[PDB]
Each structure stands twice: as structure tokens, then as C-alpha cells.
Write a protein that binds this ligand. Structure first.
Ligand code: MG
Ligand code: MG
Ligand code: MG
Ligand code: MG
Ligand code: MG
Ligand code: MG
Ligand code: MG
Ligand code: MG
Ligand code: MG
Ligand code: MG
Ligand code: MG
Ligand code: MG
Ligand code: MG
Ligand code: MG
Ligand code: MG
Ligand code: MG
Ligand code: MG
Ligand code: MG
Ligand code: MG
Ligand code: MG
Ligand code: ZN
Lengths: 146, 45, 157, 57, 112, 49, 204
RNA sequence: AUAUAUUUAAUAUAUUAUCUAUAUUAGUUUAUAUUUUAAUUAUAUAUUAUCAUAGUAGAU
RNA sequence: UGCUGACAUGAGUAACGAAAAAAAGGUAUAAACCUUUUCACCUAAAACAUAAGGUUUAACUAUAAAAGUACGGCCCCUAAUUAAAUUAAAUAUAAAUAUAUUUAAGAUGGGAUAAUCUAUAUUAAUAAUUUAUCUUAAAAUAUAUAAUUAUAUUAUAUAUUAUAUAUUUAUAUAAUAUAAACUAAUAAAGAUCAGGAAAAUUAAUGUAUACCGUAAUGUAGACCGACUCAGGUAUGUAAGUAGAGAAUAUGAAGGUGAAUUAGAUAAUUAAAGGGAAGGAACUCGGCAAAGAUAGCUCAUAAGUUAGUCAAUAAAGAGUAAUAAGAACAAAGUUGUACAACUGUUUACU
């Protein structure tokens, strides 16, 4: 520890002027740089495609299907098993895929309703259930045929 | 200074008291059966 | 010849050129998938070239990519998985603890930029008026957690 | 204060509604040692390597 | 160290409300405020008038709300894309409803 | 709400317990329910299973 | 043996001697905090990161080297190696200024959130990226002032650079061949990013 | 350096105000220090303050 | 000294848990929330990275992003060990079972390559217990008269320039270029206490890169302590100045100023500072509290089991210092009883 005694030794001979090397890089900065306000990215720069496949997750181009713009359960009816029974395999497959697609759009919407607004209306849920029923019927018919 | 006798480590606890440990040994099986008969909801860690 | 990454890239490019799959289709066919994916709104951190979905907990990254291509004709270039913690929730406090779902989300980078349609004004759409349910909740809370002379206190909700 | 509407010392927790609860509950991916791997019926796809990698089939 | 017996209703009453010291006095010392004839404590500035003055000062000596240069001409759509409004936690919500836990100064009666 | 409950079904046993409340203690829960609903939503008639 | 091409700051002379890549600067996003990291090469080590983030705090955290959360934002091709080097230096200087010397001024330009912190979603802060764009632009301008291959900025995303009007329409830029060609999405842009970068380099 | 008025033939002189004492590169891995190189990046300047048991001691 | 519930009494008493706050503005709503400025506190931490742990506590529901290279798990491989598992008749035993032997499991360990970026798959053939890196030698720098004296340097870690060979890309050579610390790799080598186990090469053909961990908290309000408990809790970095050091002082940066405030400071208590003349008269007993005239370099007796054991000896000196003047390391000599000695012991007398 430092005390009354303390003889501080010098640093170094710092290699006499002539002996040093020239620095590999000479000119560094721009000694004149201004701090300018940032430049936030704008959407005008984009060209969002109209027929972009992710629009297929919405009904038409619409955030939520309004209560008026939903198919009411008075009109909509799920597919019957017997009726399905006389349908080709390919057609059945197509139907299934359509159903799935519909569910996805409902599903997203349903999630939005539940998580954010916190609604309990459950029209979307009901629709999804109906779709699921149809799907299961289809599956049953497929099994049955085999 | 006593009091802090439980020093949690998930590995040790699953390995010693866990369902799989219980089910592997005959005594453990007895314990699980006992808990089932009592109707416990949780048969072991 | 050349190294692996480069080769992969080349393959992808070729696929794109063809107008088919930009990835090796697994020789493992499922005809009737019951899976569904939720399209989520984009976070501040996501670009317009990224979209993300809630997908099945048992969904593979590859599977998601495949699924998007086949069902929706969407080319997901890069996919990133994010499994979320289930937090303990409990209703009464006299009722048992249990964890909420482990939920799986996936971000995908596509070529073409998408943006969502702007959310409805709180009136034009019956469903997405977020106030009424909140009000109801508040009312319920008031009803439950008012004990004595707070019964007289005028309703907030 | 932790939360300014509760000034006085109540029976309130720093977070949540009860410290205790049933600990004997199915564990998820998030809990455990580094070595604890749970998995989610996602990959019986390929085969692990001798060195740590994964070769898809 | 410890009470030998349960202290009777009488005794406790007389210990508490008995002596003068322990009783709340009536605030006799209060008078009209020269600026608006409301009640105020004697030897004390009226809390309404002073508050008003402070408010006026604030309005005058208001600091310039340094709004950023970019965000002023930032398209609404663009803004939405950039900064989407999240859901706040319970705690945050609680904090926000200040009216619930925070008190605004009451106004006195008019002195006569 | 902000839950993700809809995407899962967890605490199945618990749900069953709370869903299938014994019918002799149905008066209890119903009373509480009645208490915690506005006058326009509530109805005097008893639900059927 | 130990020192790789990334290990040290590399001047123009070194580049000339080597000629690994064309004269350019790479700029990366932190994809999670929202920070931005400049570099003379398509890879980067700890040292560079350290240099960039000398005085971090709760708002400006020293980011990790987490391979995955560093995605390439910009690749700016110039004419001369020396020019590129200068640009890089300028960027660094700007960053330093933002951090320590003139932090207050920088703050006075950012977006806030009622409380008065810099606007965030999680720990992601948008402003840093914006600054990096603006800063980059400024650096470029400076370089051109100081000052045939036409210069170009290859963007991850067309969106990220504000607009062709307002900014990026200075006369100096116009006078030179400053182009704004977006990088090709085509394949995987995260996994096969290095390959893409290499390809780009080869192209020049 | 910038801002604001002045004189000069936006430029330079001088006045006032504000801000600035940094930073980058070399010297064989790292970190620090030194010296060079870069840069406007400084005073064996006056006066203060904080901390070190009231920092310690002499008076009070 | 019944049991359960309710409600009293002490009592509006004690306490509100190591503590530095102030103003202005949010907000004629704020001691306690947020922002700015001032002041302070921690700083080989109260910081920054992490492990474990846990009511997700986070900068949150629009949420913690990975083919891999100073990224971890799984996977391969085993240790300690474990396994109603495996050999007319493995052996033994009231049953349960136990045993040796195989097989499988089992991390806290081992596991190709890689910014001049890297490919693990399929088929065919035939390591390390600890510890030190001295002395010598070589060459270099100065004095003096090839040789002497004195000094530092001496195995590795890049960049630049100049050369010779394949043809600006390669190979090798020469010259140039600080200090004290640290790291890794190299070689050599001393001690007795003698220092893990386990999974081959070439050629041809290949590759679209799975799953999970990732917030924040982590010497703590987010773990274990019944509590937002002065306790317990693993690892790395830990700005300079100073110094032998991670001692001690400060503190650049970062973080923090708290579920009690405001006044008043009686008696009295705790934790400190000072004290004239005395100096153990106190007391069971100098308990407690004082008390350090270099921390570097010299110099250090008796006794002794010959070990500077005694020894950091006491005393004493050198440098510094002449009465005003940091913090931390460092507090005497001797006799006797008992026990050789370093150790261990009644977690909580
Ligand atoms: Mg206990
Ligand atoms: Mg055992
Ligand atoms: Mg606890
Ligand atoms: Mg954990
Ligand atoms: Mg990668
Ligand atoms: Mg201090
Ligand atoms: Mg009785
Ligand atoms: Mg009393
Ligand atoms: Mg008292
Ligand atoms: Mg008191
Ligand atoms: Mg306290
Ligand atoms: Mg205020
Ligand atoms: Mg230090
Ligand atoms: Mg931390
Ligand atoms: Mg094994
Ligand atoms: Mg504590
Ligand atoms: Mg006496
Ligand atoms: Mg005596
Ligand atoms: Mg001492
Ligand atoms: Mg002894
Ligand atoms: Zn008045």
C-alpha cells in the first residue's frame, strides 16, 4: 500500500521517435458529422399486391365479418352423411379443403373476438363447430366406402 | 440458522418422488394404488 | 462442385423458377389434415414481409411451410418457431392451480409484402366494440366484491 | 411503493394471488434443467447423428 | 408487562375520551379569504387562490412539448404499421385509472 | 379477456367439476350469477340442462 | 492461426492486398432489441459489437452475438475501398455521438410513450433502425463531399428506406449513380444469407 | 462548431449567446496504460464542491 | 390449561425490517407512480453477463426467433450408480426377495470439421494429481582494454515493406515494429500422495438442414427461509488513478435512493466521537475500550528436537518526518498447569 514511502517508476522510453512505424490508416473521421432526425420507413415505398395469398385468410378484404354479413344459422345447414355418400373422392377432398379454409378464417376471427374484445357471442365458434361436424361426416363416409 | 431445508432442484424431485419412480418399484406401485383408492387427484410429482 | 448451403439455395431458386415446391416434398402424404392456423396481427418488430400464425402445438416448421404452400399457395421462405410459456392461472383460489396452454406461434418471411385491413370503428361493427364486455366485467366485479355499504354506492359500469 | 393505490401494508403479494398451490402438476417444456427435454409430438422425422446433428428422412 | 384483567368498558372509555388532551378541538381559528370570501385557516394563504395562481403560472411558463420532427407528417396507415397498440397489463391499467386512488383538493364553504 | 383458453382445453377435470355442479347446490351458484348480472340481461326462469 | 480477417479493423491497403470482396459496408439489425450493427465484412465477432456499444443501459442493452437474431439490413457498394472504409468510420463516429457525446440531442429527436421513455414494444425499439438509416445516409453524404463504378445500396426491404422523395434525393447522390436495388428474396434470406451476400459480392 | 445582430466584398473581420476538451489507427491473442498518427479537442491557470470515522490534525 | 365459530381486552399501544434526499412538470389530483435537473449510495457491486429455482414476475396477448463455427440441450459415449429387465437346473432364500453375470439406463465429464467459412448421412473394401516455468546458454545494448564488467531480451500468437520460386493468386526468405498484467497453445520437469471410463481408414453416392431452451428476476420485492424477512443461495467480466494484491480510498459508466412520512431531539437505550488531573484505585477477572514511530530494506539473543523453530523475536537502524497530521495490514514480554503439534467436536447455551 502507498505510505510515506512511494517512488513512482517512469513509464517507458516509448521507442525513440525515429524507430516507430507509420500507422496503417491515416485519415479517419468526418470531423463535421451532424445528428439528423431519423427517417421512419413508409408504406408508400411498398406495393402491397392485391391478389396476395394471405388475403385468403379473410372473408373479403375485411378485418371482422359483421353480424349482418355472417351466414345466419336459419339458412346454413351442415352436410348430411347419406347425401355425402354419393360424392366422388376428389370432390370430397376438395370439399374438405374448402371447409378447412373456412375454419381458418373463422378461427382467426374467433381468436380476435376472444382475446381482444373478449366477446361471448360465439357465432364464429358455432360455425366452426358446424364445419367440423361436416368434416367428421365426410371422414366417416370415406371410411365406410373403404 | 435452520428452516430452509427444502432446496428445490427439479431433477432430483422428479427422479425421487415422480410418477415414473413410483410406478417402477413394487412399493411405489402400492403407494400409487393407495392414492387411487383414496381418490387423490395427484398421484405423485 | 460446390458446398451445401449454396446447393440448397440453387435448388430453391430452381423450384421457384419451375413454379412448384421450393423445398423437398416429404414422401409422407396426409390427405385430410384437421389442423388449422390462426393468422396473427404483426408486432412492431415484424416487417410487412413477415406474417405469423398460431399453429398446432405438434406442428413442425417444415409441415407449416408445406401446408401454407399447398392449401394457400403461399411460399414461406424462412420460418421461425416460438413456443410460449403457460402461466399458472386459477379462478376462485379455492380451486386448483393449473397452467394455461403452451401455445406455439410461427413467423414466416414471404416475398410479397402484406398489410392488414384497418380495424373497424367502434360502432360500425357489432362484434368488435370492445367496450360493452369490459363494462359487463366491471359490473360483475362490483356485484361480487362489494361487501356492505358499497351496495349503495352508485354503479360505475 | 410497489403499487401506489395500495399505500398501507395489506396482505398483498408482490405478484399474483397466492404463493402456494399444487406443485404436483404435469411439467411443460419451460421447466427443468438444461438437460430436461420434453418435446411436443413434432419430430419423429429424421435421425439424430453420432455427433449431435440431425439427418432428415 | 401484561394486563392482569380485561379492561372494563367504563375504564377504557374514560381513559380515551375522558381527558381534554385526547379530544379533538374545534378549529376556531379560521377566517374569510380576502380574494373570494371563502373560509380559510388563519395566518394561512387560501389554498384555492394560490392553486389558481400556480395553474396560471404553469399555463404561461409551460415548456414546449418537444414533439418529434418525423412523427408529425407520418401517414396514419404507416403509423399503424409501425407502432401497434398492445394490451396493457393489469397493473398498468390500475395505474392508469388515477381517479380511483388519487384525490383532488376540495373547495371550502363561503364564509358569512 | 386475453387468455388463449379457447385454443386448448386444459384443466379438463377442473372444468368438468365446475361444469357438472351437483344439482342440489345449483341454487347457490345460480344466486351468485343472479347477483352479478344487470337487470335487462337477467330472467326469472330457471335453466334446464 | 488466431487473427482472422474479422479480428481487426481493416484499412484500404489491406483490402487491396487481399481483394476478398468488393469495396462495401454491411449493416445488420438486431431483430429483437432493434439495434443496428455496422461491419466491413458479412460476418462479425464480439469485438465489433463491443466497439459499437460502449455505453449501454436499460434502453440500449449490449446485444448478444446470438447468431439467429442478427439479420442483414443493408449492403452499400461504393467505388473505392478507401471510400468504403471512410464510410464505415463515419458510421462508427455517428454511433459514438449518439451514445456518449451528444446523447441528449439524439434523445430529443426520438419518439416517446407518455411516460417519456423511448417508444418500445417489448424490448424492441424501432427508432434505432431509423437512426441507422438516417445516420448511414449522412455518412454517405459526408463521403461524397470528401470525394467509374456507380454506387448502390442493396436493401433487405424496399420499405425500410423512408421514401425516394424527401430523403435520398440530395443533389450529390443524383450526380453520382446512387442506386437503390433491393436484394433478391427468391430463396431463404436468413439461413442462406451468407451465400446470398457472396453472390452479391461476386456480381460486383 | 452553431445561432443571432454588426461591419466587409453568401465571404471575411470583430461583438454577444449556446455547446464542445472528444473520437479513430498503430505498435504480433486480450485488457489497460504510454508515445506516435488523427482531430478544435487544452492550462505545474483562480475558486469551489463531494467521499474517505466530522477523512485526518491545530485552534474554536 | 374442553372443542368450533363470532366478538372483545391489551390498544388505536409497540412496530411498519439495515437508508439521503430536493425541486419543477406530469396533474389549481401525489411524501410514496412517471419525467427532467440537483444531491447522495453500491461500485472484484446494490453493475453487466449467466446456472438453479419459481404463483410469467418481463419492456406482455400484435409476447420471449437458431443447420453450426469463444450456442446449450437430444444424439453418440461412458463415471458414480440404478434397473418385479436378461442365463429340468445362473446361485441362494418362509413369501416379499437377495446375489454375480450380461443387457439397458444414467452427467456433474468426453464427443469430427468451420470467414481465405463448414457438412455429421448411406454403400463397398481392409489425455491431463499437483506445481514451476529457474539456472545455464545464446545473441543484443553501454563502460573500459577479440576478452572483461553492468543491464535488459530470448519458445508461439500480426501487420508492412523488400526478395527468390508456381503463375494479381500461392510458397519460402529477410528487414521493421512499446510497457507491466492476463489468456490460450508449445516444449521442457520437479514432488510423492503416483494422477478417470467409454464410442479404425479409403473410395463411391449424398444434404432442402427436425425438436426443445431463449422474457425478466437471479448476493433477490420475482429462489429456499410461514412475511416484498439485515439469514441461505452456483459461475464469468468486474473503467481508470494507487498500490505487492481481488488489500484500502475514489468512482468513469450502469444501477439505486425502498409499503411509512413530517416534525421535535426531555429522561432513557443503542451505535459512535472527544475529554482536564489521575492511570486498573474498576471488576470474579484490565471484561470492554485504549494502545501500532514503515507495511520496503537492513539488523535480530537466550532456549532448542538445529527447523531464521523461537521469528513478523523483542529492543534498534536506513529512507520519510519536525507539529500538523487519509483509509486498510501490523497490537507487547514472562512464569505455571494441561495437551506434542495443523486438525475435529455438542447445527441452536
Ligand atoms: Mg417447511
Ligand atoms: Mg434409494
Ligand atoms: Mg417462496
Ligand atoms: Mg428455468
Ligand atoms: Mg445461419
Ligand atoms: Mg462512496
Ligand atoms: Mg367450557
Ligand atoms: Mg400502554
Ligand atoms: Mg409509548
Ligand atoms: Mg413508535
Ligand atoms: Mg424500510
Ligand atoms: Mg407534484
Ligand atoms: Mg478497480
Ligand atoms: Mg442481471
Ligand atoms: Mg448409453
Ligand atoms: Mg432478504
Ligand atoms: Mg473493589
Ligand atoms: Mg483490585
Ligand atoms: Mg488489525
Ligand atoms: Mg491441542
Ligand atoms: Zn380564496
Amino acid at each position: 500500500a502507498r505510505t510515506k514511502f512511494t517512488k513512482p517508476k517512469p513509464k517507458q522510453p516509448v521507442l525513440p521517435k525515429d524507430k516507430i512505424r507509420p500507422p496503417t490508416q491515416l485519415t479517419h473521421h468526418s470531423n463535421n458529422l451532424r445528428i439528423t432526425e431519423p427517417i421512419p420507413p413508409t408504406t408508400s415505398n411498398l406495393r402491397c399486391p392485391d391478389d396476395h395469398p394471405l388475403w385468403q385468410f379473410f372473408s373479403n378484404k375485411k378485418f371482422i365479418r359483421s353480424a349482418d354479413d355472417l351466414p345466419p344459422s336459419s339458412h346454413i345447414r351442415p352436410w348430411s352423411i347419406p347425401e355425402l355418400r354419393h360424392k366422388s373422392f376428389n370432390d370430397l377432398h376438395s370439399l374438405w379443403y374448402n371447409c378447412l379454409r373456412e375454419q381458418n378464417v373463422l378461427a382467426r376471427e374467433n381468436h380476435l373476438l376472444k382475446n381482444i374484445v373478449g366477446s361471448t357471442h360465439d357465432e364464429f365458434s358455432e360455425l366452426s363447430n358446424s364445419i367440423r361436424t361436416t368434416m367428421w361426416q365426410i371422414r366417416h363416409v370415406l371410411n365406410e366406402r373403404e | 440458522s435452520r428452516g430452509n431445508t427444502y432446496q428445490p432442484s427439479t431433477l432430483k424431485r422428479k427422479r425421487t418422488f415422480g410418477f415414473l419412480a413410483r410406478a417402477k418399484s413394487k412399493q411405489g406401485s402400492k403407494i400409487l394404488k393407495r392414492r387411487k383408492l383414496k381418490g387423490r387427484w395427484f398421484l405423485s410429482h | 462442385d460446390i458446398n451445401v448451403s449454396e446447393k440448397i439455395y440453387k435448388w430453391t431458386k430452381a423450384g421457384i423458377e419451375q413454379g412448384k415446391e421450393h423445398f423437398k416434398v416429404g414422401g409422407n402424404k396426409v390427405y385430410f389434415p384437421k389442423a388449422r392456423i390462426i393468422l396473427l396481427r404483426p408486432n412492431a418488430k415484424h416487417t410487412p414481409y413477415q406474417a405469423k400464425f398460431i399453429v398446432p402445438k405438434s406442428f413442425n416448421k417444415l409441415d407449416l411451410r408445406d401446408y401454407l404452400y399447398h392449401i394457400y399457395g403461399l411460399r414461406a421462405m424462412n420460418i421461425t418457431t416460438q413456443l410460449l410459456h403457460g402461466k399458472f392461472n386459477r379462478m376462485n383460489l379455492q380451486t386448483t392451480r393449473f397452467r394455461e396452454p403452451q401455445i406455439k406461434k410461427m413467423t414466416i418471411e414471404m416475398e410479397e409484402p402484406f398489410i392488414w385491413p384497418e380495424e373497424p370503428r367502434p360502432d360500425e361493427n357489432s362484434f368488435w366494440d370492445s367496450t360493452t364486455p369490459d363494462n359487463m366485467e366491471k359490473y360483475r366485479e362490483e356485484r361480487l366484491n362489494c361487501l356492505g355499504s358499497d351496495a349503495n354506492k352508485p354503479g360505475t359500469a | 411503493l410497489t403499487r401506489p393505490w395500495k399505500k398501507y401494508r395489506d396482505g398483498e403479494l408482490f405478484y399474483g394471488l397466492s404463493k402456494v398451490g399444487n406443485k404436483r402438476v404435469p411439467l411443460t417444456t419451460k421447466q427443468g434443467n438444461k438437460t430436461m427435454y420434453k418435446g411436443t409430438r413434432a419430430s419423429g422425422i429424421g435421425r439424430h447423428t453420432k455427433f449431435g446433428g440431425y439427418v432428415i428422412n | 408487562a401484561v394486563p392482569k384483567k380485561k379492561v372494563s368498558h367504563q375504564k377504557k372509555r374514560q381513559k380515551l375520551y375522558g381527558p381534554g388532551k385526547k379530544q379533538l378541538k374545534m378549529i376556531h381559528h379560521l377566517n374569510k379569504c380576502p380574494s373570494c370570501g371563502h373560509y380559510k385557516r388563519a395566518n394561512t394563504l387560501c389554498m384555492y387562490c394560490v392553486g389558481q395562481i400556480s395553474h396560471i403560472w404553469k399555463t404561461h411558463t409551460a415548456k414546449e412539448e418537444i414533439k418529434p420532427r418525423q412523427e408529425e407528417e407520418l401517414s396514419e396507415l404507416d403509423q399503424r404499421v409501425l407502432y401497434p397498440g398492445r394490451r396493457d397489463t393489469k397493473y398498468t391499467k390500475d395505474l392508469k385509472d388515477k381517479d380511483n386512488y388519487l384525490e383532488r383538493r376540495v373547495r371550502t364553504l363561503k364564509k358569512d | 379477456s386475453g387468455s388463449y383458453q379457447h385454443l386448448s382445453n386444459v384443466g379438463s377435470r377442473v372444468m368438468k367439476r365446475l361444469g357438472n355442479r351437483p344439482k342440489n347446490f345449483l341454487p347457490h351458484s345460480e344466486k351468485f350469477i343472479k347477483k352479478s348480472t344487470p337487470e335487462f340481461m337477467k330472467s326469472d326462469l330457471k335453466e334446464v340442462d | 492461426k488466431v487473427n482472422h480477417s474479422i479480428s481487426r479493423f481493416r484499412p484500404a491497403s489491406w483490402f487491396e492486398k487481399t481483394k476478398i470482396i468488393p469495396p462495401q459496408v454491411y449493416i445488420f439489425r438486431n431483430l429483437e432489441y432493434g439495434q443496428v450493427l455496422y461491419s466491413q465484412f458479412p460476418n462479425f465477432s464480439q469485438t465489433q459489437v463491443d466497439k459499437l456499444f460502449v455505453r449501454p443501459n436499460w434502453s440500449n442493452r449490449k446485444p448478444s452475438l446470438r447468431r439467429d437474431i442478427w439479420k442483414c439490413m443493408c449492403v452499400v457498394n461504393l467505388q473505392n475501398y478507401k471510400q468504403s472504409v471512410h464510410l464505415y468510420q463515419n458510421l462508427c463516429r455517428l454511433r459514438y455521438l449518439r451514445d456518449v457525446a451528444q446523447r441528449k440531442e439524439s434523445d430529443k429527436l426520438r419518439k416517446k410513450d407518455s411516460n417519456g421513455h423511448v417508444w418500445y414494444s417489448g424490448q424492441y425499439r424501432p427508432t434505432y433502425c431509423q437512426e441507422a438509416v438516417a445516420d448511414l445516409r449522412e455518412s454517405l453524404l459526408k463521403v461524397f463531399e470528401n470525394a467509374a463504378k456507380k454506387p448502390s445500396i442493396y436493401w433487405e426491404d424496399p420499405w425500410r428506406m423512408g421514401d425516394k422523395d424527401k430523403h435520398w434525393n440530395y443533389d450529390v447522390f443524383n450526380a453520382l449513380g446512387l442506386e437503390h436495388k433491393l436484394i433478391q428474396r427468391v430463396g431463404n434470406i436468413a439461413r442462406e444469407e451468407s451465400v446470398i451476400l457472396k453472390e452479391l459480392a461476386k456480381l460486383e
